[PDB]
């Protein structure tokens with residue numbers, strides 16, 4: 341018994357760095373603006389896990405509206421989403437995350453991202469894949485306006 | 498036992514007057530959606546994910562511009578026919594997940610109804626269908642309000 | 656066990672045609688700029704297969720440091736990735752690729768892409784889906800500045 345999910349997120353650059361991606365603080369000349377900490381990777385992953393569980397999305401569980409989630413970081417949101425998915429009967433298959441960013445270079449921070457996600461999800465590191473790619477100077481990411489992320493997940497019952 | 502994955506992606510540009518139709522739900526908006534079809538970007542991407550999982554190509558291959566049969570059909574009809582053809586290969590539904598990418602309008606209040614309509618079209622339980630939405634934080638064509646995109650993934654079982 | 660992977664790739668138009676998509680040469684006013692042959696569909700597919708197996712991505716597997724695959728075409732890269740993935744004990748479930756291009760027209764060329772991909776992955780044609788879509792003149796693909804590709808893959812252990 342297996343179930344698929346998909347997530348996608350974008351955050352627009354603003355302010356100063358560091359930016360936070362997959363739980364890791366990365367030195368960069370500007371920050372990521374958000375109601376939240378702007379962790380596009382953990383947000384997209386959270387939506388994919390919630391999607392596979394038919395529990396909706398991050399905004400559904402954690403409205404900006406609701407003061408209870410004020411100041412929560414993305415790993416806290418991920419762990420809470422995961423607790424609710426697990427109470428629904430699911431366990432982790434695997435996840436795959438694709439960060440879309442012209443800069444900064446992601447791959448030196450990626451090992452650490454994988455450990456944080458694997459810790460947060462109670463899974464083996466081998467169940468977690470993160471990668472990055474540019475859009476070769478094209479689009480809002482290529483122009484350096486923001487960063488995006490796509491993620492997929494497989495849950496088991 | 499045998500499960501199969503598919504992915505769908507669709508975009509339409511805003512044009513004319515609202516409402517827009519997303520996941521079979523009429524949503525009031527200042528703009529409509531330009532399409533030869535009803536412009537239902539969610540059902541179109543979902544349809545391609547399902548066809549994708551079944552290796553049946555895509556909506557364009559099933560319903561060519563030049564085939565009169567389905568010219569003028571709404572997207573739920575196309576979804577229901579695509580689905581008929583997928584089941585004729587011996588597939589049933591695992592689950593689906595849809596990700597609407599739109600700066601506006603707000604989708605979340607209409608998602609419950611979209612899910613009802615998809616579940617009835619696919620003959621499945623509500624629990625096998627997820628729909629979500631995200632903005633692009635005012636970035637890109639979606640963020641500027643030029644149109645709406647949608648991705649979908651699907652799992653089928655043989 | 657089944658595992659899921661996701662890939663995404665983009666190359667900008669530049670130079671003269673033809674471009675190569677899914678191993679198939681397609682005439683066009685412009686080429687695709689790239690260090691490699693610029694086959695976005697093969698690169699996205701390769702990344703989806705590597706992500707499923709948690710082997711990272713095409714840049715991790717083939718760094719500029721390694722002379723072995725420098726100047727290698729995208730089918731050679733796909734086949735090497737697939738060798739590394741099979742060595743981890745995986746075989747193919749199925750793949751689905753989505754080319755995102757305003758132009759050129761991809762439809763007539765898709766049948767040979769599928770044959771080439773099934774050859775390279777040692778699978779049946781029925782395990783390979785390839786489709787194309789435009790973005791209706793929106794965004795960087797819509798204005799003919801480049802071509803993007805998404806892909807997903809399911810592996811079995």
Ligand SMILES: Nc1ccn([C@@H]2O[C@H](COP(=O)(O)O)[C@@H](O)[C@H]2O)c(=O)n1
Nearest residue numbers: 398399400599602603604605630631632
């Ligand atoms: N068109 C849209 C865009 C987003 N949303 C909801 O609002 C939330 C916030 O979206 P952002 O994270 O892109 O700011 C999402 O998690 C989604 O629940 C919506 O309901 N309709």
Ligand SMILES: Nc1ccn([C@@H]2O[C@H](COP(=O)(O)O)[C@@H](O)[C@H]2O)c(=O)n1
Nearest residue numbers: 557558756757759760761762787788789
């Ligand atoms: N570059 C592209 C884009 C779309 N197409 C085809 O045209 C059909 C309709 O595309 P749109 O919905 O993007 O207008 C699709 O089925 C696809 O097969 C193509 O063959 N090459």
Ligand SMILES: Nc1ccn([C@@H]2O[C@H](COP(=O)(O)O)[C@@H](O)[C@H]2O)c(=O)n1
Nearest residue numbers: 441442444445446447472473474713714
């Ligand atoms: N922001 C980014 C973008 C790409 N990368 C790495 O660089 C490689 C090449 O990506 P591009 O093809 O977009 O140039 C990738 O395979 C990825 O491993 C990165 O580490 N950080």
Ligand SMILES: CC(C)=CCC/C(C)=C/COP(=O)(O)OP(=O)(O)O
Nearest residue numbers: 478479480481488637638794795796
């Ligand atoms: C969901 C998918 C497929 C995401 C990848 C596409 C992407 C990040 C495009 C960026 O610019 P754009 O296409 O909006 O162009 P521009 O901002 O230059 O109009």
Ligand SMILES: [Zn+2]
Nearest residue numbers: 349379380383
């Ligand atoms: Zn976010």
Ligand SMILES: [Zn+2]
Nearest residue numbers: 507537538541
């Ligand atoms: Zn459409």
Ligand SMILES: [Zn+2]
Nearest residue numbers: 664694695698
């Ligand atoms: Zn590439």
